[PDB]
Input
Amino acid sequence: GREQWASRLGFILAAMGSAVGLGNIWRFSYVTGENGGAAFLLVYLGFIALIGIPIVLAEFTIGRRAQSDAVGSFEKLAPGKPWKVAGLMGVAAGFLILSFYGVIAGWILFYLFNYITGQLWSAPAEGFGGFFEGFIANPTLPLFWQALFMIATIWIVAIGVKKGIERSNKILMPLLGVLLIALAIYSLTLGGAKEGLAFLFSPDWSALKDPGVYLAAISQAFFTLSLGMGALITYGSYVSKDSRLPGAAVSVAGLDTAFAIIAGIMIFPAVFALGLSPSGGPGLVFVVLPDIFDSIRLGPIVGIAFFILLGAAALSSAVSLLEVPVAYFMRKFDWSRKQAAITLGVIITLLGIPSSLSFGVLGEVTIIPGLNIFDSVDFIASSVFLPLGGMIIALFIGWGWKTSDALAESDLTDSVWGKLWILSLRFIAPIAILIVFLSAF
Ligand SMILES: CCCCCCCCCCCCO[C@@H]1O[C@H](CO)[C@@H](O[C@H]2O[C@H](CO)[C@@H](O)[C@H](O)[C@H]2O)[C@H](O)[C@H]1O
Ligand SMILES: CCCCCCCCS[C@@H]1O[C@H](CO)[C@@H](O)[C@H](O)[C@H]1O
Ligand SMILES: CCCCCCCCS[C@@H]1O[C@H](CO)[C@@H](O)[C@H](O)[C@H]1O
Ligand SMILES: N[C@@H](Cc1ccccc1)C(=O)O
Ligand code: NA
Ligand code: NA
Output
């Protein structure tokens, strides 16, 4: 008795709701800032076109054909073949990513609370920077808001696909977009527009000499597209043949890129106007945006609206993150949805506590040489499991399927686009991920 999307637009809006989240604003900004900007952006955009869209369609095709979880899709379509490692890696990536994703979303709820209680209407005495560092260094305060955000995530996933995940408000994502556009226009009028736009669109190829820039670009591309972990396999597994998968993949990647680019047009001209370093780090948007809201007269209102709509997008993205282990645990151990959502959601919440403490008392600890627990967990998930999982997924359709089956199940003919998509999965995307891997070591 597997669930299905009740409405016709349920699938595409859920995929869009999974893609558009904290990766478009919070992560895109601080990764672009510390990687040089425009040159990193063009590689990132190229990764979205030639690798992201094909592998997104790949995950859709696997999910709808198999009607199973991320791991079960490989067992059903290729029994006893080693392709199921991608789903296994993807389930574990759901644990690691959601562990720290709920921490950052806990920052969102905390800032929303401070605007609703009138705390951040004016600049605190310690400054918008010192206020942010004092809150993340506090050992217990972020955990309370992290747990609060996880309770919402657990609640939606436990309610179900039809009654929970699908029942997301269809105005919040367009309202987030309209506000980002309105905010991007305003930051262009703050004085740092020339150097901010040059940093974002005028590329310096000297940064591309580093192989690590390519690894950050492929990681952000996979991360922002909810790609390489079976998250799109799971949402595709609730779709009937009613849908057209090609247009869904292009619309998902096209909308996700628009959110990211406009976020950069909002953030970076504001960074230069404030004279701050764009390589500030994970708290970049949390220091820049409240300082931009403070310059507006109706600033507190924009801040309340911004963090509500951003938290709403973070909620729908964390739901798809939790859905991957929930669906896998329901099939494998015959767990109910409620027990899988509660038990796995509690475990993931505790897993993220050490990464939350990395910003404070555990700042000295390393796991991956030179990286704290937060950066170590983000690195193995975003830079290792997602690109490798996406590489295996591309090779699965490219070399483990019949060509006619790959095109027919993906709603494509043997046309120029059908051949371009098969070429990407067989060669272009896997070799690109492979070359990015090898050069980074
Ligand atoms: C959006 C959903 C809202 C539902 C939740 C509503 C109930 C919220 C309960 C209030 C919890 C507030 O808890 C209290 O917060 C304030 C800051 O806000 C902290 O007060 C102080 O502590 C920390 C550092 O110690 C500082 O970052 C902060 O600037 C300072 O004001 C208290 O140390 C904390 O105990
Ligand atoms: C629908 C969204 C439209 C948003 C437009 C916001 C532009 C704000 S103008 C404002 O005028 C001042 C001088 O008059 C300058 O000093 C400021 O730098 C500048 O910010
Ligand atoms: C939504 C607003 C979009 C604005 C896009 C601006 C892209 C041009 S940036 C950069 O600015 C410098 C100005 O001198 C030049 O040196 C560079 O050649 C040029 O590339
Ligand atoms: N795409 C989400 C992050 C995500 C990754 C993997 C699965 C689901 C969601 C974002 O950009 O916020
Ligand atoms: Na995204
Ligand atoms: Na979202």
